[PDB]
Amino acid sequence: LRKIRAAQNISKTIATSQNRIYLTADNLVLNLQDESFTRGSDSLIKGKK
Amino acid sequence: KAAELIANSLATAGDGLIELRKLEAAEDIAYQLSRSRNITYLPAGQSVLLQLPQ
């Protein structure tokens, strides 16, 4: 059984391995805009008295 | 004991029992031999700013 122990130990060391694959992503952004954008103007002709 | 019980169960369940136990085991063995896989996805997008038209 010493033989088995040693074989076990060697097998253990050699054997260890593992793989895995998955896809995930993390992202976060917060944009705060309290406004409707301006700088919007049509072409109109206006005049004042 | 498990082996004894399995043998007993298969004996009762007949040959058909044994056969597909063998298949299950084969499936297990095959899985272990090659355990891995992935799933494919189509692309996601990223954020962007939307401008509303006037």
Curated annotation (Swiss-Prot), chain A:
Belongs to the prohibitin family. Expressed in myoblasts. Protein with pleiotropic attributes mediated in a cell-compartment- and tissue-specific manner, which include the plasma membrane-associated cell signaling functions, mitochondrial chaperone, and transcriptional co-regulator of transcription factors and sex steroid hormones in the nucleus. In the mitochondria, together with PHB, forms large ring complexes (prohibitin complexes) in the inner mitochondrial membrane (IMM) and functions as a chaperone protein that stabilizes mitochondrial respiratory enzymes and maintains mitochondrial integrity in the IMM, which is required for mitochondrial morphogenesis, neuronal survival, and normal lifespan. The prohibitin complex, with DNAJC19, regulates cardiolipin remodeling and the protein turnover of OMA1 in a cardiolipin-binding manner. Also regulates cytochrome-c oxidase assembly (COX) and mitochondrial respiration. The modification N6-acetyllysine is found at residue 12. This is Prohibitin-2. Phosphorylated. Tyrosine phosphorylation is indirectly stimulated by IGFBP6. Induction: Expression increases approximately 3-fold upon entry into G1 phase compared to other phases of the cell cycle. Also induced following inhibition of mitochondrial protein synthesis by thiamphenicol. The mitochondrial prohibitin complex consists of two subunits (PHB1 and PHB2), assembled into a membrane-associated ring-shaped supercomplex of approximately 1 mDa. Interacts with ESR1, HDAC1 and HDAC5. Interacts with ZNF703. Interacts with STOML2. Interacts with ARFGEF3. Interacts with SPHK2. Interacts with COX4I1; the interaction associates PHB2 with COX. Interacts with MAP1LC3B (membrane-bound form LC3-II); the interaction is direct and upon mitochondrial depolarization and proteasome-dependent outer membrane rupture. Interacts with IGFBP6 (via C-terminal domain). Interacts with CLPB. The chain holds residues 251 to 299 of 299 of the full protein.
From Swiss-Prot, chain B:
This is Prohibitin 1. Protein with pleiotropic attributes mediated in a cell-compartment- and tissue-specific manner, which include the plasma membrane-associated cell signaling functions, mitochondrial chaperone, and transcriptional co-regulator of transcription factors in the nucleus. Plays a role in adipose tissue and glucose homeostasis in a sex-specific manner. Contributes to pulmonary vascular remodeling by accelerating proliferation of pulmonary arterial smooth muscle cells. In the mitochondria, together with PHB2, forms large ring complexes (prohibitin complexes) in the inner mitochondrial membrane (IMM) and functions as a chaperone protein that stabilizes mitochondrial respiratory enzymes and maintains mitochondrial integrity in the IMM, which is required for mitochondrial morphogenesis, neuronal survival, and normal lifespan. The prohibitin complex, with DNAJC19, regulates cardiolipin remodeling and the protein turnover of OMA1 in a cardiolipin-binding manner. Regulates mitochondrial respiration activity playing a role in cellular aging. Induction: Expression increases approximately 3-fold upon entry into G1 phase compared with other phases of the cell cycle. Also induced following inhibition of mitochondrial protein synthesis by thiamphenicol. It comes from the Eukaryota. The modification Phosphotyrosine is found at residue 31. The chain holds residues 219 to 272 of 272 of the full protein. Belongs to the prohibitin family. It comes from Homo sapiens. Widely expressed in different tissues. The mitochondrial prohibitin complex consists of two subunits (PHB1 and PHB2), assembled into a membrane-associated ring-shaped supercomplex of approximately 1 mDa. Interacts with STOML2. Interacts with MAP1LC3B (membrane-bound form LC3-II); the interaction requires PHB2 and takes place upon Parkin-mediated mitochondrial damage. Interacts with STAT3 (unphosphorylated or phosphorylated at 'Ser-727'). Interacts with CLPB. Interacts with CD86 (via cytoplasmic domain); the interactions increases after priming with CD40. (Microbial infection) Interacts with SARS coronavirus/SARS-CoV nsp2 protein. The lineage of its organism: Eukaryota, Metazoa, Chordata, Craniata, Vertebrata. It is found in: Mitochondrion inner membrane; Nucleus; Cytoplasm; Cell membrane.
